[PDB]
Ligand binder design. Structure first.
Ligand SMILES: CCCCCCCCCCCC(=O)OC[C@H](COP(=O)(O)OCC[N+](C)(C)C)OC(=O)CCCCCCCCCCC
Ligand SMILES: CCCCCCCCCCCC(=O)OC[C@H](COP(=O)(O)OCC[N+](C)(C)C)OC(=O)CCCCCCCCCCC
Ligand SMILES: CCCCCCCCCCCC(=O)OC[C@H](COP(=O)(O)OCC[N+](C)(C)C)OC(=O)CCCCCCCCCCC
Ligand SMILES: CCCCCCCCCCCC(=O)OC[C@H](COP(=O)(O)OCC[N+](C)(C)C)OC(=O)CCCCCCCCCCC
Ligand SMILES: CCCCCCCCCCCC(=O)OC[C@H](COP(=O)(O)OCC[N+](C)(C)C)OC(=O)CCCCCCCCCCC
Ligand SMILES: CCCCCCCCCCCC(=O)OC[C@H](COP(=O)(O)OCC[N+](C)(C)C)OC(=O)CCCCCCCCCCC
Ligand SMILES: CCCCCCCCCCCC(=O)OC[C@H](COP(=O)(O)OCC[N+](C)(C)C)OC(=O)CCCCCCCCCCC
Ligand SMILES: CCCCCCCCCCCCO[C@@H]1O[C@H](CO)[C@@H](O[C@H]2O[C@H](CO)[C@@H](O)[C@H](O)[C@H]2O)[C@H](O)[C@H]1O
Ligand SMILES: CCCCCCCCCCCCO[C@@H]1O[C@H](CO)[C@@H](O[C@H]2O[C@H](CO)[C@@H](O)[C@H](O)[C@H]2O)[C@H](O)[C@H]1O
Ligand SMILES: CCCCCCCCCCCCO[C@@H]1O[C@H](CO)[C@@H](O[C@H]2O[C@H](CO)[C@@H](O)[C@H](O)[C@H]2O)[C@H](O)[C@H]1O
Ligand SMILES: CCCCCCCCCCCCO[C@@H]1O[C@H](CO)[C@@H](O[C@H]2O[C@H](CO)[C@@H](O)[C@H](O)[C@H]2O)[C@H](O)[C@H]1O
Ligand SMILES: CCCCCCCCCCCCO[C@@H]1O[C@H](CO)[C@@H](O[C@H]2O[C@H](CO)[C@@H](O)[C@H](O)[C@H]2O)[C@H](O)[C@H]1O
Ligand SMILES: [Cl-]
Ligand SMILES: [Cl-]
Ligand SMILES: [Cl-]
Ligand SMILES: [Cl-]
Ligand SMILES: [Cl-]
Ligand SMILES: [Cl-]
Ligand SMILES: [Cl-]
Ligand code: NA
Ligand code: NA
Ligand code: NA
Ligand code: NA
Ligand code: NA
Ligand code: NA
Lengths: 311, 311, 311, 311, 311
């Protein structure tokens, strides 16, 4: 079966729609998500036209094999989608209404700069390659674009699922390709990071600062080095979940900066001891008293500066 | 093959049943479970009717291809179910009895608020899309809904497997859809968490409180910081298994609260030392004596308050 | 093709056999194992009978499609077995001899009570559903039940592979089902746990008891808390491999009990210090001297009691 | 269907092209990458030639089954590629233009010597085995070799995707094989390793060197041993991601060398204490003062030497 | 299609060959490897014979369906191999030459006794079951056994790929089975274990021995216990990669033995302190001086003895 012939030299418009049924497994590190949706397609094939008076029927149902169907593929998929044709309906004028249900592992990158206080635009790109007889162009039927109310992406809030209605038409290997951009706008549920990582991480840092109210070098060394190790554990846990980005992230900046605070606290603890040994405890006392204010103040300003740069 | 024609304008009732054979792999983090069950379907197709006297046979067996079979799908599946037709039987009146055995990875969310002392309702949603000629409606044949006594979900107790008999009929992409809710009510076997996480986690906390019967700052620092680190390890272990929830959980509340106890114990240990150094050990002694009672009392009340709020 | 017709009203006996070729991937946590075996089936179909004198041939080979074959399924499988038909042979009386080679992920639970000194009975349940015309019953042909000498389950010793010859015949959804129990009796190779977990775990415990020959509180705190942390690491390692059981296990009991020994050692260390500070070292000395004997004695008796209760 | 016959004695030239659509999952440890691309093939089959007047069509579309297609395989794949034929077009002279879209897990090794400041050449080898009637030879159609501008390999920069135009023609099992080398030149985005591993790892090392400004053996032992343990954690994290190479890597050399610095710091700390105890603090003081300069200087030179050897 | 008939009562010889293209994913813990190779088969079918003068053709190419092909399976595979037929060629005498390209996950056990200084013999067992009409026997065509020079098993050196030319013929379920043993002899690239595990593990042990040049109990306790914990980390890392063997391994013996050295060092440190407290430092001094020589000497001899027993 060949494609529908043109009345004049007009391209064949394949009207499309994606209706999300299930949306799951957003793997931040892999920059992939899994989708289970309806894909609706509609085009006119005048060869399939019939008089509803003579045929009696208002619609005709065909099996995929029986008629010409455009080869629509997804651009940003890992492997070709698992699809199962739900229905093919032909109206008297030869307007075909195709509907399939698919599942695919979509590969769409994320911007980790503001994580875990980030929003993302996930993309699903539909594409059609033109044939030798006819040039095929994609369209968005907005009435057939949507999502189920139940659609739950774990740890994310779904804001919108819309399509950029004008296709990106371009030549590829001396044939026209018509690409459509479906955008799933989501935003991260940052809540759990506050009691699980952020607050634990701050408590261990504040525990290191108790060394500014201690003259015991042996105890201070323990306080600052032990807490530094706990910070390393959190840094490792975090980087095992976040992918390695060519750009600096907000979480990255904060986690790194905190190392400097541990490093400088070790210097303070060392300086204080050296002076106490050198029989200069008055000077050590001045440095320790300053540190008590300096450390939280510099920490607060540094965070204000970082938050400002990133948001 | 087209759907059965109506005797008036009645919808086609497809009677359904799910009989669980195997029920496994409840992945709390993924909010998925795997099921292996029988799916039974029954509808009347008058075109298949026969006189048992003339045909001799009381029943006729057909191959799926030979007759019209309704396209029943599962809503909340990752990928389309692996199904293998067991039997298709037609009675003289044209009543079809279909039976298949399937396996599917069902995606049903969990409420982690009371974990690990939680119960869940897992769902399996059956659905059928209406055709242009006939509107298809699902029904529950209660005699064909059940589970094997052997059905064992590891780390969970199966309470019930029932169906909400009235289908949810609604329009989707300008066609009627008939949805049925099958509910598997389960409850967590919390036992192992008591000797594995809960009691170990309490023992390390109580070990930190031995610092209230010690004047050795260096030893106290070791006690409180070491145990804090062991608590961090347990917190990490727990959050690697529990998914990140937009809501506060009972396990989350407790784990977080305990950090405050470690933080305040470090403050106490610091204050006690500072005073001992400042040649004020009487005041330090009063604070230490109070802490001995205050810490367990506040811990017990805080837990009473939390348990109350959550249960 | 319909099932073979009965001479009188007798059920159709399908003689079965399973011959293990490969037996691998026993995942204790998942309570699954993978099997690769021969499945042999044999039944009489009088319609296939021939005179070996007239036909010349002593046997006839058929393709699965050519004849009626009973639908045999496995009960406790995750997904339906990957099977590839090896041979179908018909004798002059119409006795069919079917042989296929399959692979399946069998789901059979384990009793972790005595782990790692435990034995298990793995099961493979064969089943057949009766048809409308004839009732099908399973049988065990013992000459066709066995295992390859090479069959190696890693970390386990294969004791036996036998079948419970009497099938479990029962009604399920108003049809007879005939179930056969194939049992693979195995026993754990516990050896490696002795040098890898058991002895390391005891050495760290005995290191904590060296605090009973020390008056240095600071050193004792370090000994007992450090070793407690190493025990937590081993506890975590162990529970990451063992599934969460609703019952107490031998490994669970021991690992838990050891926490009590660490907890009580911390109390001893605390009491000894308090008394030494209170200028009562004679009393502290008596308590420390007792602990030296009490701790190993109570440890040995507690283990004797536990081993007795579990074995 | 047999291969096209030769006019003369010429081999059959199959012109090839690979156009990368998606390029993902570079697993350094596994030395594999996943690709999703177009594979274009073109050859002349004079048997397929036609008159466009008689057939009406100027080009003919065939299903793969309908005609002879060369069996092109990938050499360095794990499993045979998932391919889905996009189009097969025959021109009146019998010139066939085949296009499929595939996904494959390509197995191409990496040189970890300069990691994470390394570049790689990934390979995709196309191959065709000659038949008994005709010898088949591969060619590169450069106009059909390329990549999408969007093609993003996470944590890597794509430099080029080119083909070595001359095939490697050789005998294999008494038949000619024609192999083509497609090369994807990439280079690692090393950035994230600086704040995540490199700088944390240096800070802990520099913290160990604060023991050269301390006379407290107990504190020094803590500083050097604690930081040594944090270095072990980083070493483990790194080797869990990098494969085990038979050659020394730059990351390997650095990580190993740092152990020597920790080992020697422990010796210094031990020597300093021994002398202080032996009532020789003047000698200990000289050794400690030297260490303050020696340790960073030797560290800097050692790194200069290593960087020089590796780059 | 039936098998070739015998001239006289002779078995049918199927000549075989395996030519490795790709050899990857040796999973020591799983005792599996993945292979991608050519499988060549050749037998005489006199029914396929032709006169090359009358037929014109020197060879005939058949589709698998067209002729009788022996059912060859692999014994030690997880699941049946993914195979794709490359060619089937018949010579005038009826000599068939079959060639397919396959991929399979082969399950062949390893002897971990000498790891990581171990060599292995991996096996690929080819098998054929005799049919009722003819008995089938396997043979090795040595000209068709080989490997690509590029064949690279990561972290292993490929020494040889040969076949044991005489098959293992045996009866299985009253039919002859002919088994061929293909052996891939490999040897581990132990290099990386020296800088990654072996040398780090020795450095931490030697750091524990610095306690023999210290009178500070508190510091010694820290040295020996901290390093013991780092040894536990390495032991865990190692056993997460090595499978649990019913026999003692070289790596196992060494790792275990080292615990005894840590245990005894703790005893020495304890004895030294007890004596120092008991105002007997002269005796403690003698014990400490002995330990300085005893510990390395006993370590070196113990290793000599172990290496001797294992190699
Ligand atoms: C360690 C210190 C951690 C500090 C965290 C600061 C977070 C922040 O300031 O995050 C910023 C986000 C804002 O999100 P936004 O919508 O992307 O702002 C976009 C604004 N534009 C469009 C103008 C650029 O704040 C929140 O959602 C509030 C939650 C903060 C909770 C922190 C608890 C501790
Ligand atoms: C650290 C401190 C941990 C304290 C744990 C308290 C658990 C609790 O109180 O859990 C609550 C559950 C109750 O389960 P429920 O049926 O959902 O109650 C629903 C009640 N309504 C319907 C009225 C709201 O108690 C149990 O099953 C008993 C097991 C507790 C063992 C704790 C051992 C320690
Ligand atoms: C920490 C302390 C750990 C103590 C371990 C005790 C093990 C035990 O006693 O295990 C019990 C098993 C017995 O196995 P069974 O056949 O199931 O006995 C069933 C007996 N009935 C049928 C009468 C009930 O002993 C063994 O196989 C011997 C190996 C023990 C090695 C321990 C080394 C340390
Ligand atoms: C003068 C002190 C020289 C120290 C040399 C140490 C050599 C270590 C070589 C390891 C080879 C692998 C192995 C244990 C090392 C212990 C070193 C103790 C130093 C004692 C200082 C006494 C001061 C007089
Ligand atoms: C611990 C110490 C770590 C030191 C790291 C040195 C890296 C280096 O010197 O890396 C070398 C690479 C160069 O890359 P190249 O193109 O392969 O040079 C090939 C040169 N030929 C062709 C002449 C042989 O430098 C970079 O890209 C710059 C980034 C360095 C950042 C380091 C931050 C700390
Ligand atoms: C003279 C001291 C001999 C020490 C022998 C130790 C035997 C341990 C055997 C473990 C068997 C498994 C188990 C605890 C070991 C504590 C040892 C304390 C040593 C006290 C020294 C006092 C100096 C007089
Ligand atoms: C902690 C101490 C670790 C000591 C390691 C000893 C290794 C050894 O002695 O290993 C033995 C292997 C020999 O390999 P083989 O061919 O199997 O010998 C078989 C001999 N027959 C056939 C006679 C029985 O030595 C090597 O390849 C050399 C590498 C050793 C590097 C060690 C660096 C440290
Ligand atoms: C500002 C101070 C520092 C703040 C703390 C740092 C938090 C920064 C955000 C880190 C984001 C982590 O991103 C983490 O990625 C992994 C991917 O490997 C996800 O991992 C998993 O997610 C869900 C289960 O929950 C699965 O459906 C998914 O398939 C799986 O990959 C985690 O659910 C996600 O949360
Ligand atoms: C109140 C103080 C704190 C109490 C301690 C905290 C306990 C809270 C409950 C945590 C629930 C953990 O939930 C954990 O999730 C993972 C999913 O990644 C499951 O993981 C696994 O389960 C089984 C094996 O056992 C598999 O069939 C499944 O496929 C797999 O994912 C764990 O079996 C489950 O137990
Ligand atoms: C008495 C004191 C305490 C003694 C120490 C405690 C030991 C108790 C027994 C623990 C049993 C651990 O059980 C562990 O389970 C996991 C499943 O996740 C298995 O894990 C793996 O096994 C093999 C590889 O070896 C694979 O084929 C399998 O697919 C995989 O899951 C481990 O091989 C098994 O050993
Ligand atoms: C000079 C001092 C030391 C410097 C620090 C050391 C860094 C050296 C380079 C280490 C390279 C690590 O290489 C690491 O390999 C694993 C493979 O298991 C990749 O692992 C993963 O990558 C991505 C997700 O992020 C997936 O698409 C991929 O399938 C998966 O395997 C890591 O993304 C990669 O970064
Ligand atoms: C004598 C003192 C002690 C010496 C140190 C101890 C070393 C002893 C040898 C340990 C062998 C470890 O064996 C380890 O097993 C795992 C199996 O999951 C392999 O794991 C992985 O290997 C490669 C990637 O590198 C993959 O293709 C493979 O699929 C994967 O399983 C490791 O590559 C292997 O190295
Ligand atoms: Cl697609
Ligand atoms: Cl479905
Ligand atoms: Cl099955
Ligand atoms: Cl391929
Ligand atoms: Cl096979
Ligand atoms: Cl025999
Ligand atoms: Cl035989
Ligand atoms: Na079509
Ligand atoms: Na300490
Ligand atoms: Na049908
Ligand atoms: Na059949
Ligand atoms: Na073809
Ligand atoms: Na055949």
């Amino acid at each position: 079966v060949s494609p529908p012939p043109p009345i004049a030299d007009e391209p064949l418009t394949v009207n499309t729609g994606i209706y999300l049924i299930e949306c799951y497994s957003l793997d931040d590190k892999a920059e992939t998500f899994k989708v289970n949706a309806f894909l609706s397609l509609s085009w006119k094939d005048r060869r399939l036209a019939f008089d509803p008076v003579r045929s009696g029927v208002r619609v005709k149902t065909y099996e995929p094999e029986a008629i010409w169907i455009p080869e629509i593929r997804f651009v940003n998929v890992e492997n070709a989608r698992d699809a199962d044709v739900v229905d093919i309906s032909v109206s008297p004028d030869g307007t075909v209404q195709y509907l399939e249900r698919f599942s695919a592992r979509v590969l769409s990158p994320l911007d980790f700069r503001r994580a875990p206080f980030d929003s993302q635009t996930l993309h699903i790109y539909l594409i059609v390659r033109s044939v030798d007889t006819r040039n095929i162009v994609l369209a968005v039927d907005l009435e057939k674009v949507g999502k189920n109310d139940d659609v739950f992406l774990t740890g994310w809030d779904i804001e919108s699922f819309t399509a950029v209605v004008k296709p990106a038409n371009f030549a590829l290997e001396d044939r026209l390709e018509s690409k459509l951009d479906y955008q799933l706008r989501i935003s991260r549920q940052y809540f759990s990071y506050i009691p699980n990582i952020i607050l634990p991480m701050l408590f261990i840092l504040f525990i290191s600062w108790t060394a500014f109210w201690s003259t015991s070098y042996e105890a201070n060394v323990t306080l600052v080095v032990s807490t530094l190790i706990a910070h390393i554990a959190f840094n490792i846990l975090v980087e095992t979940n976040l992918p390695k980005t060519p750009y600096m992230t907000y979480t990255g900046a904060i986690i790194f900066m905190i190392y400097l605070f541990y490093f400088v606290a070790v210097i303070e603890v060392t300086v204080q001891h050296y002076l106490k040994v050198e029989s200069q405890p008055a000077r050590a006392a001045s440095i320790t008293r300053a540190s008590r204010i300096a450390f939280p103040v510099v920490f607060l300003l540094a965070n204000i500066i970082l938050a400002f740069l990133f948001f």
